[PDB]
């Protein structure tokens, strides 16, 4: 049968031009006020998926 | 017992030694209190972390009445 993509991972990772996956930083939901502005500012932009987790991401996303 | 507690080591100490070439913004040493003081072309962070303000070689020197140890960058 067709492989089923992990739908939870498909809503948080997008494939990039060179095959990478971008995700938003964590720790910015509901305890952010006590965090310094510089910390919040750095967490706002999108981030790249680390090399260690690349294999796991590709396994969860076989069609993308 | 009521003991047996500690915190993870913060990896302080000298990261770049004398004569090493560093890029601007690279931290040379992380410390608790001013064991080293910032000299020429060297900045001091809010936690007394000394960082390079210019590219060049790291040099350690001792000057002043207090016999303190200073870090400077010779930017060639």
């Amino acid at each position: 049968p067709k492989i089923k993509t992990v739908r939870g991972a498909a809503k948080r990772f997008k494939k990039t031009g060179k095959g990478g996956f971008k995700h938003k930083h964590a720790n910015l939901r509901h305890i952010l006020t006590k965090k310094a502005t510089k910390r919040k500012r750095h967490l706002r932009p999108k981030a790249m998926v680390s090399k260690g987790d690349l294999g796991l991401v590709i396994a969860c996303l076989p069609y993308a | 017992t009521r003991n047996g507690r500690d915190s993870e080591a913060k990896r302080l100490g000298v990261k770049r030694f004398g004569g090493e070439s560093v890029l601007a913004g690279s931290i040379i040493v992380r410390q608790r209190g001013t064991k080293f003081h910032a000299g020429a072309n060297v900045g001091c962070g809010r936690d007394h972390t000394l960082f390079a303000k210019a590219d060049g070689k790291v040099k350690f020197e001792v000057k002043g009445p207090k016999n303190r140890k200073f870090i400077s960058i010779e930017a060639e």
Partner: protein, 51 residues
């Protein structure tokens, strides 16, 4: 062809090691298992929408 004698180099274990999940029949953890922690695709928050 594993498990077909000493000379084959894959005998008596079939390349599965010693008594792990991978050595059990039908054994092995599912995709994204991180040893017990919630995996990275669940530590991180959802974002965006599909147009």
């Amino acid at each position: 062809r594993l498990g077909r004698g000493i000379g084959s180099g894959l005998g008596k274990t079939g390349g599965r090691g010693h008594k792990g999940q991978k050595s059990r029949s039908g054994g092995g953890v599912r995709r994204g298992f991180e040893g017990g922690q919630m995996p990275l695709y669940r530590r991180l928050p959802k974002f965006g929408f599909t147009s």
